[PDB]
Each structure stands twice: as structure tokens, then as C-alpha cells.
Design a protein around this nucleic acid. Structure first.
Lengths: 372, 941, 358
DNA sequence: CGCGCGCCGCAGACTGTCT
DNA sequence: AGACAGTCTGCGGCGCGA
């Protein structure tokens, strides 16, 4: 409740008051705010690094939003299946490989009662899908490996990893699979599914010959089983945003009201500012630091264009609710000695630090947050 | 053919022992001993008759057949040792060769390259660079004829693999070119298992017929130190007895040489380039390091010369020597799943600790507030911390989009002006101050910024620290835990403060209620419960499952912290040793044709062995000591990395056939007391508990006890296991601690009233006391152990200490007897595998357990052999002492485990990661009494 | 011509050789792009984001749905952007000059008589005071032309022209000179209160922003570039006897290629894995050309890696187990250099930075 | 209990600075 | 030349196993 009004005050969840649990989960929300877009981009980049970039055999693939007769798409798996034969040549038939993609998928939403949506009210969800072609013999080993890896990735960047959970499941055909959930305050919601299709789709879409679908898992060539790992990121953003917030504890007496997002996926890292002093000769230093940090790759909230200053304490609350790691204040004393202030996310203690080597400090803070 | 029981289930038929000495006609004493206080009535359940055709005995009599077997086993190795014992030793060479491979130095220091040292006896040593520690680095050897050195490709600089196949030094020649000893070689060394780990042919699956002797093993058997004896020996560089100092030494080579040889003291390198040095410094100081290693080798040769006759006279029976030779041959095979297991365990450990680390850093960060308003002073938890602070010690309209923005670099160089301020000032503080603004307590928890292994937040914050309990932990009503001298009470074995906060948290002077809120700032706290030794970490987990213990944030946070700590404690302790194990991966050519021809041979897969590097007699009871393999956790689901044993997997076409002695120590004590009392096997009451005892009835050893609380599973068994060994009165009061913790004088009276397994002044034991034989052996000074003879130690012998360290002396008997049992098992197994073609002579070294790497086609046959040994071994325990016969219950192993991996039970999955199907490891289906249908000859069935 | 065949063989364009054609590529009615094409698209989108969004502090990301919720797949991101103009006004403190950018897929009809063609486009909408609207239009046109010419091997092919439609007062359009002729790759439009207050009818007291007080009405500048046509133009620019396909270092999908020559031992795979991890930890994408069947050829391998537009070819030989020297072959200069292992990562990082700077 | 092998946290004493 | 950072280095405390 309060988390929702915070999200919207600071343009994270989106726009207008129509958003709710059902609309947010179903994908009928009007759209994410700029901070929501940045969070989605960071989460997609983290998923890409953990899945595609760090794995030699996983490759990028593109699936058209619509298929020819067309009624759009409900999953990214079909594109990977169509690209299986083409991408087998790329991997020179090294059978245990994969195709990864991130894209928007469309699902019908049934409001029911009045205003029957039927095919209308299409809900859009950002799906990250990895289709992993594996030998039949080691299909379960790769299933367990991918389940563990995805659970680690979700538990990574998690303020309370215990909320993320996993469960086993069987399909109507008896095929094994796993489902990952996040424990929202109301209850557990599905965020990702691993399914072991077992090469049915390959023979379905390629019924002519099997000789062209043969891939080498060693000395022998077999028909691969398919492992579809499909996670959704919009619910992922919702899970991370809810986890970063506090509950909804005994003798707490603390009401900071801060979104403690992980540094790796935080929308904005450091917010620049100007202290009490003479105008000009400080805007130039802030502009130079801004340019340095953008050339680095760290997203920066300018902050020095606002002139209220909110008594220097309310803007700290604004940045805390905005999930900003550091608050850099450039005061008139910076020209005498090049020392700036750093409030930092959590541990609301002022840090005096030289403006030089802030490049190294921020880069190391961002890089070393991934590991522990 | 006949039951042949004599009122107890006795071993059916007598093949090797013969028929004589039928009965001493003193059965009445045992009869009315067992009549007293019940226990005489017994079902006397029979067992199925076993008829087996044992292999022929060369000796024609037990205790001489085994002597002949041990002599035939150790003849060439003893001959080689005797050849090495003579003094034809030239002086050390002036300059070492500095060449690859093996180089020999004869007279005048001339160095000749030789493919292999053609010597039957050698004293060997290897020095290893800690960097890339798997490779052996350098090594030297000495023989009666000449000296030998080996460098391991130090002339050429390259990048080398981590597989370590060809890295170890070669020490065995081809069987086609052997001396006319002949095909038998013996290598002596201090900690010789370490050197064996670096031998090229020691990793082959097939037997190598080379044996090793450990100087530490011989020293420990002859003169070792146990527990305080060792520490006191370090303390002096025991009450009213210190003679043992003059005949005792620590296991280190320097002190051993000082005690035995007594020559000039050995000196170690202050540089320690092998341990704390790089490879280049070893290259530059090659001559000095090789000289030091050669000096150490000379010291070990001298110690071996002084030890061999003393060891032989203190251990006359050749069986002990043969078992010592056989124990230093453990193989412990592994495959590519070992590396995967190591990676998985490390990743799981990182996951679990990272979760707890984040959970603790969150509390630390949230607590880092309360400094602005000085709220920590009024806090009931964090008001003890210092909370120090230290100074740094130093509209305008749109105006258009504009153009010519290329001059932006001006402001860029304006930033460089502040870089200039690094030099024009800042010199008043050049050393980087570590978080001046944060509180000092939070300052301590963060890594230094200059640390290469630096992570954000207070990463140096785990459990069991002095601040973590203050962050959240709380017991009952009383919040504080001063820990200034004593923590917040609890544990097993006993022995300004805002009062407004004390009143608010409520929900000499004395206290009406012992528990509840803490009062006053005086840290004496009336001394309630254990005071100094309270960690507040683990023991309180079952006491925390109620309102007496509560965490701050939630009711499940504290339990989660305790559970995760329990999960990762074992790996935190053991990961350095487990991950550092040396593994040598055999190539395709090294594997035998059986492995490659066998199905399910995982091509593109790594197979190797991990020689345990086990000290044969590291403990004064001659017990094998190895920190990891001998002492490792059995597979458990909660603990991380507990599946270490399960990863010892036989290669394709091979299996592990082993067993476990059923109540080895208890049975040994029972039979010893039984022989001391009378000549029949069921004479002692304790013997009748051990022999033919069932938990269903009162015949069990633990069930017949008083059981004041009334539990047989835990209460009655720990009592029995503690009364034996230490027999401590604090251990008796621990029962009052467990339950009925009231009326302490009544507890003392009850303990005094318990005469069972206890002796009075009227000295020696009376009634059910097996300790009499142990005490008699402990004060003899002749070869002490009853089975085949072995003196305890010149340090712990009588006349060195009058009455001191008695418990160690009495436990040495039953412990040294178990070692003799193990040696007998090894000798019998070697004889059976040699006489009949049973390939897979290799064994795995465990205590109270022996596993053997055998081919699948002889998996059952070998098992039968084991059972035969399990007969012939126990018969030795019968042949010694007055027990001419053996009971049928203990005649055979309960079950012989045939498996593909090493585990306590074959019908058990580790489930540490809850996916035991990741590795291909099916069940074992152990055989018990079903193997007798076959015969030990190959051409059967 | 040979360009389409080369891009099909090297997995830049996905589909059959006959199916791809030329006209289907200009429209969205093509099967898609290969993994190399997808990575090139990702690089182009990321660099567009860096040059447009982060550098200009006022520009903020926006999220527009692929479909209109009531009365249809979107044909342009401008209309999607304008719904959140009012909300993003509060974020910028109602200061009128500011932008909203997004890269997303848009669907168009192509004359199964009628087909749906999807193309990804990057669109920025810049709300400005009306008086400075033309100046901002010129500024954005110049910056976009500079951005498109930055990576061009022949920047003369990228040109600009004036359209001056009857609806908007002023506008520009950027063209790339393909071999057949010029093709539009980016459009610049200036629109007044038209189709801004229409979506918010009634009083304009809620939609106007402050600029020197007086709460002047906004004027929108729509700049919309076609990234798929951008890759088509860049691939045609790269081509020119050898099939080299010199893509820009910042835009090339694969930077370096790892391979092995003589395979003496398995340790070559170990050192290759280590170098792979080191290169990927720093953000350098490397094609795992090693672990390939028996090293079919070397010169053919270089030709293949050229046709994939790999900046450098790294070959590890037996001599690499004595010193860190490996063979480094340059795509452009076709020169081979002995170069140590430890200097490869920093060298590649500095090469990429130098290419980005100029 | 009686031992075997490990680890990790905290108060004191050297240098090793530095201004 | 007179105060405060690093290392060891000695204490107490784990944990774990036949």
C-alpha cells in the first residue's frame, strides 16, 4: 500500500492511480516510470551477463513479435525452435548449447464480470527466455544445473533471499520442470519456469527427416531435448522493489523509508549536488564530475539544477526513496581543499573524501557489490 | 555338523584350532556370577550353521601360521632395511648437479644422469614449493652406494598444467630389469607418506610392490607424547613426575633427531622459501635449499638406523611390521566428479555465508543510525559501544541550445585543478584514513579500502563476534550481555546502565527471581550458570525454540542464523584441507585394459587417486592419523560438504569391497575382561552384554543400567561410554545437568550408590569389572598389549610416572589392541589376495574399517576372503589368552559392503545438496552369510 | 549482391538465401537477424542511448506499450511518449526544456496481400519553449548527423535534407546512400501545440511548463531513427577484393577471436578458458573460436573472422606455454604481432577507447 | 569421556610510520 | 620526536570424528 504510493511519487511503478496488485501482475499497467525503465534495463543486463555473456555456447536470438499465418506471440520459445536448425551450424553441431532472448510477450487478460475483455485487454510482460538444447542422456543434469543457477541469480541482488523459493512440477504429458516464486506480502507469485519439453517440438515443426536435426553430444549424434527457462522481469522488478522495502520490527523506532535496492541493479547510483557557497565555480566542477561519471558508465542524478535544497535533509529522504547509493555534495570548501561529502545509502553518516579517485571508488563499489 | 555351543552360541566346527583343552571345570564361578543381579536367564537364540572349507594353513597352528605369513610378506623389505642399516655411506657431494631427472653422485661428487635409481633400499625426501603446490619441486634420496637428486624441470621456464600426471618423481624401475632384493623396494622417510604422494608409479591402479617406512611412526610407537604430555613437553622445551621429558620428543624431525641421535642440532631455514617463498627465490637459492634437504635426509637416515632395532625389539611380532608396511599403500581413487564436488561445495558455502553476511550487514547498517540524536545511550543493547567520531585531519530562461560545445574540455581541465589540490595541499594527512565519520564499532567491521579483497559494507561481521549478539539477540526479559568478563549465562558446564530501559523492557541486594531482567551495572551478576565459557552461538538452538530466547527483527531470524551456521561450520573448518588435496589424473595409457574395455567408461573424463598422506602411527596407540580422511564427517543432509567420502569412487570396472568391525573396542574390552576372569567367552557379565545382547530385552549393555531419566537411546549409552575410558564424576553430574537438575547431594548419593562397572577398595575390581585386565597391563613394563606384544612407550612406561595420565594408559590397551586387529586383518587380506589370484590388492585406510579396490569379476570372491580374515583374525584374539574357542555371533562381519563409492552404508544418499542423482551412484546390496555358497578359487560358479 | 550472401553465411541475417532478398530487408517483413546481427543491434542501441539519453541530463527514459489499450499495435513511439509528458513534467520540476527517449519495436503495414513489418526505432521527443523550438531542431539535427557519421567508414554517404511538410513548420530527414540509392534512416519533425493539447483537452493549465516564468506552452520535437536500416547502412558501408567488412570497433558484434594453432596438450584449452574469463570480466566480447574440430585451416579461419567483422584474431600456440606471447592479427592492417598475455585486455580496452574518442 | 585434527575472535607488544 | 596504524602472538572459545 504505502510502497505503491512511494513508487509513484518517485516515478518507479508508472503513472496514474489505476495500478493495483492484479493489474501490475497481469501486465495491464500503463507502463513503467523512468526509474522503472532503468531498473528493467539493469535487471536485463544482469540476466544477460549471468546467462548469455558468461556462457560460451549460449547465443542471442531474435523472435518476431508476430508470426505469419498472425496473432502476436505468447512466448519466445517458438522463435528459438525455428532458429535451432540455423544456429546449429554456428555451434558446428556441438549439441549442448542454447539460445537466449529478452522481449515483450502478450497474454490475454480476463477481467470477467462487467466489461468482458475476451481477446482485448492484452497484457504485456517482459520475458527472458533461454531455450537450451541438451543431449537426452544429461537432460536432467542440465535441468538441475539451470534451476540452481537461476535460483542463485534471483537470490543474488536479493535483500532477503529466503523469500525466493523453488518447487518441482510435472506437465500434463508427465514432463519434469521447476517453478520459482517470490513471496510477496499477499502470497507467493510465480516469476520463472523451467520445463523439459523433451524434443517433441523439434519433431513437430520438423517432421520430414531427423537426419538434418542431428547434433553431436560426443562421438554419437542425437536429437536434443529442449529445456525452456522462461522468467519474467516485470514481476522480477516488483519482487525486488517489494523486497528492498521493509516489512509491510520490535522497538524499531526507525522510519527512514528507503528503497534498499542492490547496487548492481539500482536505477540511479550517485546523486550530485551543490552546497552552500558562491554560484558558478561550483557548477563547472559539478559538470566536470558529471561528464567523468557518464564517461565511466555510472548513472548520475544531476541534483544541482534544483534550487530549493529542501533544507539539506528532505532531499536526502527523496534520494533514499529514489534508491540512490551516494549523495555527492560539492561545497565552497571544495575549491580550497578538493573534499566532497558522501552521505551514502544506509549508514546515514557524512563521509569526507577527496574528489580525486572518486572514479576508482565508485567503480570498485559497483564491481565488488556483485561478489558478497 | 554339530551345534557345539556349550550354553552359548559358539563358532560351528573347528578347522584350524584343533580339538584340545575342552573344559577347565571352573564353570560354577561364572554361573553364580551371572546368577547375581539377574542376567542369567537368556533366550539363547541359535544362528544358522556355517560350513566353510578354509584355505590350507602353512603354519599348521594359529599364531604360527600368521607368523609365517608376516615373515613371507616382510622378508624382502626387512632384508632391504638391513642392507640400508649397514654403514657404507659416503659424504655429501660438494656441488649439486642442477639438472632434470635423476642424477647420481658417487665418489668425489661426480654427477651422472641416471633414468632411475637402481637401489633396493632408499631414504627419500621431497621439498615442495607452496606456489603451485601440486608439483613436487625438488627431491633427494640416499642409498648405501651413492647419493641421488631430482629437480623436476627447473632449468626451463614454462607454464604447466594443474593435472600433475608426469610431475611426480619416478622411483620404480621396470619389472624386466630388476636386481637378482628383487622386485621389492623399501623407502624410508620422515613423514614418508608426503614423499609417497609425489611418486609417479604410486598412483597406478595396479599394485606397485614398493613399501614405505615413516620415521614419525616408529618414533611415536617407541616414544611419543599424548595430549598434555605433548603440550607440557613444549612448555618445558604432570605432577611430581617429569622423567618422561628425558625420553620423550615431539614428532618434528629436529627434536626426534635430538632425542635419538643426539648429535649437533638441526637448523631450519629462516627464509622458508618452500613455504613462504616464490619460485624464483628457490631457483636462486637452489644450492642452499638442496643442502638443507640433504641434511634432513641424513638426519632421517641416522634416526632410522637408531630406530629399526629398537622398533623390532619393542614390536617383536612380524605381523605388526607387515601391517605397518601395508597401511602406507592406501589408494583412494577418484574421478572428474571430485572437482565438480569441490566447486559445488565452495559455491554452496559462498551462498550460505553471503546470505548470513547480508542479513548481518543490514542490522549493522540500520544500527549505524541512533548517533545523530545520541539515541545509542538510551538504547538497551548498543549503549556499551564507543560510538567515536574522528575528524578528517585535513530560471534565466532557456537561453537557446547554444553551439560550439567543443570547449566543454575547459571544465574538464577545471576538474584537473582539483587533482592539483592533491599536491598543493592534503599533505597533512597522507595515510588514507579509514571511515572517520562512521562509529568506531562500525569502523572495525569494514575491510580496509586498500585491501585487494575489499567488499562494501561491514563485510567483517559474522556470528560468534562480540557485537552480533548486541545487534539483535535477547534472552527472556533481560536484554544486556556485557561479556566484559562473563557472557550472558547459559551453556552446559557451570563456571552507565539505563535502569529506565530495564523497567521499560519489563513484560548483596539479592534478586527475588533468578531469571528475568538484569539489574545494576555491577558485572558480578551473582554468578548464575556458566559464566566465562558462554558463546551464545550454538548450544542454545534447542533452548531457543520457546519464549526464553528471541531475536530482534523476527522470530525466525535467530533460528535461521543458527541453522545456517550449523550448516556451514564443517566446511568453514575443513575447506582448506579438502580443497588442497593432491589429485593426479592418470592418462589413457596408464589405465589398465580392463577399465577402457569396460562399459560406462566415461570418455573425455578424468580418473586419478588421492593418496591420503596418512601417518601410519601418528597416535601413541599406533593408530593411523590423518586430519581429513580418517577424521571426516559422514554424509549428512544439513551439513555442507559432508559428502566427502562419497566422492571416493572406484574407476569403471572396479568396486570397493569392505566391512566394519561390530563394536571393536567394546568387544575387545569384553573379551579381555572375559579372559582375565575365566576361560569361557560368556563368563563376564559385560561379555554377555556384548556377546548375545539384544536391545529388545534387558540383555543389552545400555538397557540394563538404572536409567534414572529412563532413556536407552541417548541417556544410557553416553553414560556407559563415559564410565569406560575416563570414568569421571563430572561426567556423572552431567546426567543431573541433562534432566532432574535438582537435589545435587541426592545426585551424588545416587552416583555413589551405583556400584555397577565400579570398584571399591576391597587393590582390584570386584563383581562386574573389566578394568582389572587393563590396569594389570598398564603396570607391567614388558611387551604390554596381549595380542602379539607391543610396548606402549618409553615416555608413558611405568617408573617414568607413578600415578599420572592413568586414563591414557588404560585406554591405550583397548586402542592398541584395535590397531593390532587392524594389522592382523591387513596381513590376512594380503595373504589371501596373494595365494589366490584376486587382483585389486589395493586397500583404503580407515580406522575400524577396511575397504579394498577390487575388480567387479571378483567382487564377491574378495568379500568372502574378507569374511575369512574376519574369522582368522578373531581366532588370533582367541588363540592368545585362555579362550581356545570363539563365539559364533562375532565370527563373521555383520555385512560386507560392495559398492562403487565409499560411504558408511550403501543404502544411504548424502542429499547434502538434495540432488543425489547428479552423480551415477547406485546402491551396494551388501552380502552377509550369502557368500559362503562359493569358494575362494577362481574357477567356481 | 555478395553483401547479402556474406551476411547470411556469417549469421548476420537469419533465413534462406533466396528468402532474404533486398526489399524485404528495408521493411520489417524479413525473418530477422542472426546472433551477430542481434549483437550489432544491441551495440547500436546502447551507443545511441549513451549519446542521447545519459549525456543530456534532461532526457529521461519512457515506457510505451506495444499496443493501444482501447479505441491496435503502435506505429510510432511519439504517441506512446506523449501520454507520460504530464507525469514526467513533475519529475523535471515543470522545467519546459526536456526530453523523453525510447528504443522500441514499431509495426507497419506493407502492401496475405497485406503484411505486418516490424522494425526497431529509437525515438526522442523534446519539449521546448516554442521560440527556441527551431534552434533546438537545428541542434538535434546536427547532433544526430554527427552521431550517424561518427561510425561511418565513408561519412559522405550519410547526408541530410529538408522536407518542410505542410503539417509541421520545419523538419529534416537523414539519408544513407545505399548502392541502389538514398534511403531515409532518420526523421526530424517540429510540431506545435497540435496533437499535444488534443490528448489533454480543456484547460492547458496542467500541461504547460515554466521557462523564464510565464508558463509558456510546449513545442514538441520528434526525432525518430530506424536502427535496422542503421545496421543495413553500416554493413553496406563496411564492404568495399578481400571480403573484409570493416565494421567500427565500437559497433562490431565480436571484438576478438580466440583460437589455437598447434594443439600440443590440453592446457591450451585451460589457458584459453582463463583468457576468455579475463576478457569477459572487463566487458570485451570474444568469439570462442578454439575447441573447434582439429583446426581445419588457418588462412580460411582468418577469412571467416574477417567476414564476421572481428577486430582481432588471437592464436595460442605451443610457444605460449613458455612466454605469454600469442599471435594477434589485425582485421584492418592484416598484420600479425607477437603479444604477451597480460597486455591483451588493457590493449583491447585502450583500442576501444581510442576508437570511441575519434 | 580419552584423545587426533582443524579454525576464528580479541587484548598486548614490536615496528613503522608520520607531521 | 611524540602520538596512532599494521602485523604477529598469545589467550580463549568453537567444530568434528572412530
Amino acid at each position: 500500500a504505502l510502497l505503491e504510493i512511494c513508487q509513484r511519487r518517485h516515478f518507479l511503478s508508472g503513472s496514474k492511480q489505476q495500478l493495483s496488485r492484479d493489474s501490475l501482475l497481469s501486465g495491464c499497467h500503463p507502463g513503467f516510470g523512468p526509474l522503472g525503465v532503468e531498473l528493467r534495463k539493469n535487471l536485463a543486463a544482469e540476466w544477460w551477463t549471468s546467462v548469455v555473456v558468461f556462457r560460451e555456447q549460449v547465443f542471442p536470438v531474435d523472435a518476431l513479435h508476430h508470426k505469419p499465418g498472425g496473432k502476436l506471440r505468447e512466448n519466445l520459445l517458438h522463435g528459438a525452435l525455428e532458429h535451432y536448425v540455423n544456429c546449429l551450424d554456428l555451434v558446428n553441431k556441438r549439441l549442448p548449447y542454447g539460445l537466449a532472448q529478452i522481449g515483450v510477450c502478450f497474454h490475454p487478460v480476463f477481467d470477467t464480470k462487467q466489461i468482458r475483455n475476451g481477446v482485448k485487454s492484452i497484457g504485456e510482460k517482459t520475458e527472458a527466455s533461454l531455450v537450451w538444447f541438451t543431449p537426452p542422456r544429461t537432460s536432467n543434469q542440465w535441468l538441475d544445473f539451470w534451476l540452481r543457477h537461476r535460483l542463485q541469480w534471483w537470490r543474488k541482488f536479493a535483500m532477503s533471499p529466503s523469500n525466493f523459493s523453488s518447487s518441482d512440477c510435472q506437465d500434463e504429458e508427465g514432463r519434469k520442470g521447476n517453478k520459482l516464486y517470490y513471496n510477496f506480502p499477499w502470497g507467493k507469485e510465480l516469476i520463472e519456469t523451467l520445463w523439459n519439453l523433451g524434443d517433441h517440438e523439434l519433431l513437430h515443426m520438423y517432421p520430414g527427416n531427423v537426419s538434418k536435426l542431428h547434433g553431436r553430444d560426443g562421438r554419437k549424434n542425437v536429437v536434443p531435448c529442449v529445456l525452456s527457462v522462461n522468467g519474467d522481469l516485470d514481476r522480477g522488478m516488483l519482487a525486488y522493489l517489494y523486497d528492498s522495502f521493509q516489512l509491510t520490527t520490535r522497538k524499531k523506532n526507525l522510519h527512514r523509508k528507503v528503497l534498499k535496492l542492490h547496487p548492481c541493479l539500482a536505477p540511479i547510483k550517485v546523486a550530485l549536488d551543490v552546497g552552500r557557497g558562491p554560484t558558478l565555480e561550483l557548477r563547472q566542477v559539478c559538470q566536470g564530475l558529471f561528464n567523468e561519471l557518464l564517461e565511466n558508465g555510472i548513472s548520475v542524478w544531476p541534483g544541482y539544477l534544483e534550487t530549493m535544497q529542501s533544507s539539506l535533509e528532505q532531499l536526502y529522504s527523496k534520494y533514499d526513496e529514489m534508491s540512490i547509493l551516494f549523495t555527492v555534495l560539492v561545497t565552497e570548501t571544495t575549491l580550497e581543499n578538493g573534499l566532497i561529502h558522501l552521505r551514502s545509502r544506509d549508514t546515514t553518516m557524512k563521509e569526507m573524501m577527496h574528489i580525486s579517485k572518486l572514479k576508482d571508488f565508485l567503480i570498485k563499489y559497483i564491481s565488488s557489490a556483485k561478489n558478497v | 555338523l554339530d551345534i557345539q555351543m556349550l550354553s552359548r552360541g559358539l563358532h560351528e566346527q573347528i578347522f584350524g584350532q584343533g580339538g584340545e583343552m575342552p573344559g577347565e571345570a571352573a564353570v560354577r564361578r561364572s554361573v553364580e556370577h551371572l546368577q547375581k543381579h539377574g542376567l542369567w536367564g537368556q533366550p539363547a537364540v541359535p544362528l544358522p550353521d556355517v560350513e566353510l572349507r578354509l584355505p590350507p594353513l602353512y603354519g599348521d597352528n594359529l599364531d604360527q601360521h600368521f607368523r609365517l605369513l608376516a615373515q613371507k610378506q616382510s622378508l624382502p623389505y626387512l632384508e632391504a632395511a638391513n642392507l640400508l642399516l649397514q654403514a657404507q655411506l659416503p659424504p655429501k657431494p660438494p656441488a649439486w648437479a642442477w639438472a632434470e631427472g635423476w642424477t647420481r653422485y658417487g665418489p668425489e661428487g661426480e654427477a651422472v644422469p641416471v633414468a632411475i635409481p637402481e637401489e633396493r633400499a632408499l631414504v627419500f625426501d621431497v621439498e615442495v614449493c607452496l606456489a603451485e603446490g601440486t608439483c613436487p619441486t625438488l627431491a633427494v634420496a640416499i642409498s648405501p652406494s651413492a647419493w641421488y637428486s631430482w629437480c623436476s624441470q627447473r632449468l626451463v621456464e614454462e607454464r604447466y598444467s594443474w593435472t600433475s600426471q608426469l610431475s611426480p618423481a619416478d622411483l620404480i624401475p621396470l619389472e624386466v630389469p630388476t636386481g637378482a632384493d628383487w622386485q621389492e623396494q623399501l623407502v624410508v622417510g620422515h613423514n614418508v607418506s608426503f614423499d609417497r604422494a609425489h611418486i609417479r608409479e604410486q598412483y597406478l591402479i595396479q599394485g606397485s610392490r614398493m613399501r614405505f617406512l615413516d620415521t614419525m611412526s616408529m618414533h611415536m610407537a617407541i616414544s611419543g607424547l599424548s595430549s598434555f604430555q605433548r603440550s607440557l613437553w613444549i612448555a618445558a622445551k604432570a605432577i611430581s613426575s617429569w622423567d618422561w621429558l628425558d625420553i620423550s620428543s615431539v614428532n618434528s624431525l629436529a627434536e626426534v633427531h635430538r632425542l635419538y641421535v643426539g648429535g649437533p642440532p638441526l637448523e631450519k631455514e629462516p627464509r622458508e622459501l618452500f613455504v613462504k617463498g616464490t619460485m624464483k627465490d628457490i631457483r636462486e637459492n637452489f644450492q642452499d635449499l638442496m643442502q638443507y634437504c640433504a641434511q634432513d635426509v641424513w638426519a632421517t637416515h641416522e634416526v632410522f638406523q637408531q630406530q629399526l632395532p629398537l622398533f623390532l625389539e619393542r614390536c617383536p611380532h612380524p605381523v605388526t611390521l607387515a601391517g605397518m608396511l601395508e597401511m602406507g599403500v592406501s589408494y583412494l581413487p577418484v574421478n572428474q566428479n571430485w572437482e565438480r564436488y569441490l566447486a559445488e561445495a565452495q559455491g554452496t558455502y559462498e551462498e550460505l555465508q553471503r546470505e548470513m553476511k547480508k542479513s548481518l550487514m543490514d542490522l549493522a547498517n540500520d544500527a549505524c543510525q541512533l548517533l545523530s540524536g545520541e539515541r545509542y545511550k538510551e538504547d538497551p543493547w548498543l549503549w556499551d559501544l564507543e560510538w567515536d567520531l574522528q575528524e578528517f585531519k585535513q530560471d534565466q530562461e532557456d537561453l537557446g541550445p547554444c553551439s560550439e560545445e567543443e570547449e566543454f574540455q575547459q571544465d574538464v581541465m577545471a576538474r584537473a585543478c582539483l587533482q592539483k589540490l592533491k599536491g598543493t595541499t592534503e599533505l597533512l594527512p597522507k595515510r588514507p584514513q579509514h571511515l572517520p565519520g562512521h562509529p568506531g564499532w562500525y569502523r572495525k567491521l569494514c575491510p580496509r579500502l586498500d585491501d585487494p579483497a575489499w567488499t562494501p559494507g561491514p563485510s567483517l561481521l559474522s556470528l560468534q563476534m562480540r557485537v552480533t549478539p548486541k545487534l539483535m539477540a535477547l534472552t527472556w526479559d533481560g536484554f544486556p550481555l556485557h561479556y566484559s568478563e562473563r557472557h550472558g549465562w547459559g551453556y552446559l558446564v557451570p563456571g552507565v546502565c539505563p535502569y529506565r530501559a530495564i523497567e521499560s523492557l519489563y513484560r548483596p541486594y539479592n534478586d527475588v527471581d533468578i531469571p528475568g531482567c538484569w539489574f545494576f551495572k555491577l558485572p558480578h551478576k551473582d554468578g548464575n550458570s556458566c559464566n566465562v565459557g558462554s558463546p551464545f552461538a550454538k548450544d542454545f538452538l534447542p533452548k531457543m525454540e520457546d519464549g526464553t530466547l528471541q531475536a530482534g527483527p523476527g522470530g525466525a531470524s535467530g533460528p535461521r542464523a543458527l541453522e545456517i551456521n550449523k550448516m556451514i561450520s564443517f566446511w568453514r573448518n575443513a575447506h582448506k584441507r579438502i580443497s588442497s588435496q593432491m589429485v593426479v589424473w592418470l592418462p589413457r595409457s596408464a589405465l589398465p585394459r580392463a577399465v577402457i574395455r569396460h562399459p560406462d567408461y566415461d570418455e573425455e573424463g578424468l580418473y586419478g587417486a588421492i593418496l591420503p598422506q596418512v601417518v601410519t602411527a601418528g597416535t601413541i596407540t599406533r593408530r593411523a592419523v590423518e586430519p581429513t580422511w580418517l577424521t571426516a564427517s559422514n554424509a549428512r543432509p544439513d551439513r555442507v560438504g559432508s559428502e566427502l567420502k562419497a566422492m571416493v569412487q572406484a574407476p569403471p570396472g572396479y568396486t570397493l569391497v569392505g566391512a566394519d568391525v561390530d563394536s571393536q573396542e567394546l568387544w575387545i574390552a569384553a573379551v579381555l575382561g572375559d579372559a582375565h576372569f575365566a576361560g569361557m567367552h560368556g563368563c563376564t557379565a559385560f561379555g554377555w552384554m556384548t556377546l548375545q545382547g539384544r536391545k529388545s530385552r534387558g540383555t543389552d549393555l545400555h538397557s540394563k543400567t538404572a536409567t534414572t531419566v529412563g532413556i536407552s537411546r541417548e541417556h544410557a549409552k553416553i553414560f556407559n561410554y563415559g564410565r569406560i575410558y575416563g570414568a569421571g564424576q563430572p561426567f556423572a553430574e552431567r546426567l543431573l545437568m541433562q534432566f532432574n537438575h535438582r537435589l545435587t547431594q541426592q545426585e551424588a548419593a545416587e552416583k555413589a550408590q551405583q556400584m555397577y562397572a565400579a570398584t571399591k577398595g576391597l587393590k582390584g575390581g570386584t563383581e562386574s569389572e573389566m578394568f582389572n585386565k587393563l590396569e594389570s597391563i598398564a603396570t607391567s613394563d614388558i611387551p604390554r598389549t596381549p595380542v602379539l606384544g607391543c610396548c606402549i612407550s618409553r615416555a608413558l612406561e611405568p617408573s617414568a610416572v607413578q600415578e599420572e595420565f592413568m586414563t591414557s594408559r588404560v585406554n591405550w590397551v583397548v586402542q592398541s589392541s584395535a590397531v593390532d586387529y587392524l594389522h592382523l586383518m591387513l596381513v590376512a587380506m594380503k595373504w589371501l589376495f596373494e595365494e589366490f589370484a584376486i587382483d585389486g590388492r589395493f586397500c583404503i585406510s580407515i580406522h575400524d574399517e577396511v575397504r579394498y579396490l577390487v575388480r567387479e569379476e571378483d567382487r564377491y570372491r574378495a568379500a568372502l576372503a574378507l569374511q575369512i580374515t574376519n574369522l582368522l583374525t578373531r581366532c588370533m584374539f582367541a588363540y592368545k589368552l585362555g579362550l581356545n574357542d570363539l563365539p559364533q555371533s562375532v565370527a563373521f562381519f555383520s555385512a560386507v559392503d560392495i559398492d562403487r563409492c565409499l560411504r558408511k552404508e550403501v543404502t544411504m544418499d548424502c542429499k547434502t545438496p538434495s540432488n543425489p542423482t547428479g552423480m551415477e551412484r547406485r546402491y551396494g546390496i551388501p552380502q552377509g552369510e550369502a557368500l559362503d555358497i562359493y569358494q575362494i578359487i577362481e574357477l567356481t560358479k
